[PDB]
């Protein structure tokens, strides 16, 4: 399996690199290495590629990025009638789309860090590069604030987030993961990074998020959720079992109601949670 080897080579060469962009690069490399002049023959190969990428990596962003890439392949196949020019069209359009995606995080940082007040308190969850990029743009914009990061028990990455913030020389504190309701009254805003956004406006994240969301609901705190556009999922989980069980495995994913979410911070801008369904219905899976 050269696809999983190329995916692990793209994901392990950079620790600042997400899993979804590595999966999209692996899918583009597999489409460039396919050279099969068939629409359904390429669609079945892409579906087996996303099957391998979901059997290997249990992340939601990998399958999300593969579904967006499959919708992009379907749009490029429905646009051009002949396949010979359509192969080069898919290659150039996918390379330009990956170039647009690789600059997305900086766009989130300059368009997101404007909201954070000076002299305030930030409550944040486990390790991701997006909230570090937003916070380093905030401290590059000459802002001072106190940071409380969840320890995030199943893999101690919030302590790694705190180490990365102490190397940034900012006041950060590892707070107990059973104490997100203890420090909610002092946290005037709760900004969190997500790994997958479902259609109605809710999010798919790490297990300690949703309870914090209802701590943001009873205590009236603005629960800000930060995520890019390739994490948009065409699913509707109703209850906590209604997420797909292959992404769970002690649960690993909690569904957060869209009423508990104040704003989203995507590449389209600062959006209401109802905007994700707009993008997902003009995208049509």
């Amino acid at each position: 399996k050269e696809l999983i080897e190329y995916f692990k080579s793209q994901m392990k060469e950079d620790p600042d690199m997400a899993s979804a962009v590595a999966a999209i690069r692996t899918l583009l490399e597999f489409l460039k290495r396919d050279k099969g002049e068939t629409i359904q023959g390429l669609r079945a190969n892409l579906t087996s590629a996303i099957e391998t990428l979901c059997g290997v990596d249990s992340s939601v962003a990998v399958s999300s990025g593969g579904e967006l890439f499959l919708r992009f392949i379907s749009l490029a196949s429905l646009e051009y009638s002949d396949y010979s020019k359509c192969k080069k069209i898919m290659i150039e359009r996918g390379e330009l789309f990956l170039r647009r995606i690789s600059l997305s995080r900086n766009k989130i940082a300059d368009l997101c860090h404007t909201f954070i007040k000076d002299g305030a308190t930030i409550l944040t969850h486990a390790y991701s590069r997006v909230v570090l990029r937003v916070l380093e743009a905030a401290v590059a914009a000459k802002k001072r604030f106190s940071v409380y990061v969840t320890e995030s028990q199943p893999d101690l990455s919030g302590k790694k987030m705190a180490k990365a913030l102490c190397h940034l020389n900012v006041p950060v504190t590892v707070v107990l993961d059973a104490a997100v309701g203890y420090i909610m009254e002092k946290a005037d805003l709760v900004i969190v990074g997500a790994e997958g956004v479902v259609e109605n406006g809710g999010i798919i994240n790490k297990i300690g998020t949703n309870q914090m969301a209802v701590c943001a609901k009873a205590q009236n705190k603005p629960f800000y959720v930060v995520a890019e556009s390739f994490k948009f999922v065409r699913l509707f989980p109703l209850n906590q079992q209604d997420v797909p069980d292959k992404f769970k495995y002690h649960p690993w994913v909690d569904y957060t109601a869209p009423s508990l979410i104040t704003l989203l911070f995507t590449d389209l801008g600062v959006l209401t949670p109802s905007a994700v369904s707009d993008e997902l219905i003009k995208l049509y899976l």
């Binding site: 404007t114 909201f115 007040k117 104040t262 600062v270 959006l271 209401t272 949670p273 109802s274 905007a275």
Partner: protein, 317 residues
């Protein structure tokens, strides 16, 4: 020429000193007339040069008064109209008359806004109803004074403490005979147990569905969310702004504290800190429905009107 800068500086210090004119639809007509005078009194080869020009004078006009967003969003709407015409002509010399007729279409759209809200006003009022409003706005009083032509109901106009402008709304609605009740601003939750729905106006709709309005209405929105009564925001589409709430803390407009604590209070005015914010912030979760001239919209739909009327590249202006 020179007369253009005469009128521009007169508009700038008119916005700087006080409210000139009084209501906002005349101000939007003045802004569109000033913008058509700017595009008819200049020379350009590319549309981007006029775009940079309009961005500079929009920066100047919103630096005159940062609290009033109508001039800024009108400049941004004219900028998106120019961008749409350049995009539909790019895929050259006939651009100027196209922007002129587009500004004329926007003027015909803008003069018939309140009467379109009045035409769709009968879809929200039933017989023997208890309505509570705040502040003073000619859209909401026109709404109620023509909705009382076929229905009989009750309107409770609550005054606002900095400038009790609801007395004018009370004596304007009482001439139409809508059984107007006048109260203070402190009895809202005292009377929220009987108010069936809340029909208010606003000053500026924000990008996320939130709104700034006359002060004390966030309390009214909280009480109406506590009692689960629907909120009707009778607002036009020139009060629609892409400015986010948490942006450089320039939200509230503070005025002189004489109307709160007079100058004849004594020597105790030295050791006191009196603030008078005339505007207040209402989140979109405390709002049920917006009523514009094109119909009723959700607070979960303000982003679509934002992307349909404004461009994300012009948010910095």
């Amino acid at each position: 020429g020179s007369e253009l800068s005469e009128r521009i500086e007169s508009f700038v210090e008119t916005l700087k000193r006080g409210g000139g004119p009084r209501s906002s639809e005349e101000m939007a007509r003045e802004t569109l007339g000033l913008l058509r005078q700017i595009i008819t009194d200049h020379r350009w080869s590319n549309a981007g040069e006029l775009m940079e020009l309009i961005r500079r004078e929009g920066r100047r006009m919103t630096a005159a008064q940062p609290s009033e967003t109508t001039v800024g969003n009108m400049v941004r709407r004219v900028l998106k109209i120019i961008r749409e015409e350049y995009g539909r002509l790019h895929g050259y010399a006939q651009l100027q008359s196209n922007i002129i007729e587009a500004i004329n279409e926007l003027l015909v759209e803008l003069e018939g806004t309140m009467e379109n809200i009045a035409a769709q006003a009968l879809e929200h009022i039933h017989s023997n109803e208890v309505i509570m409003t705040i502040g003073f706005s000619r859209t909401v009083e026109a709404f109620l004074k023509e909705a009382a032509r076929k229905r009989k109901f009750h309107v409770i106009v609550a005054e606002c403490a900095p400038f009790c402008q609801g007395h004018e709304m009370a004596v304007n609605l009482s001439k139409a005979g809508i059984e107007t009740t006048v109260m203070t601003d402190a009895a809202i939750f005292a009377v929220m147990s009987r108010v069936n729905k809340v029909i208010i106006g606003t000053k500026t709709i924000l990008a996320n569905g939130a709104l700034r309005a006359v002060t004390g209405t966030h309390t009214l929105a909280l009480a109406a969310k506590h009692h689960s009564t629907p909120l009707i925001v009778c607002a036009p589409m020139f009060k629609l702004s892409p400015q986010f709430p948490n942006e450089e803390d320039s939200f509230h407009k503070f005025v002189a504290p004489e109307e709160v604590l007079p100058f004849t209070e004594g020597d105790i005015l030295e050791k006191v800190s009196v603030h008078c914010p005339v505007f207040d912030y209402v989140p979109p979760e405390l709002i049920t429905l917006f009523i514009s001239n094109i119909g009723g919209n959700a607070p979960s739909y303000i982003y679509r009107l934002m992307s349909e009327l404004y461009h994300p590249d012009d948010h910095v202006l």
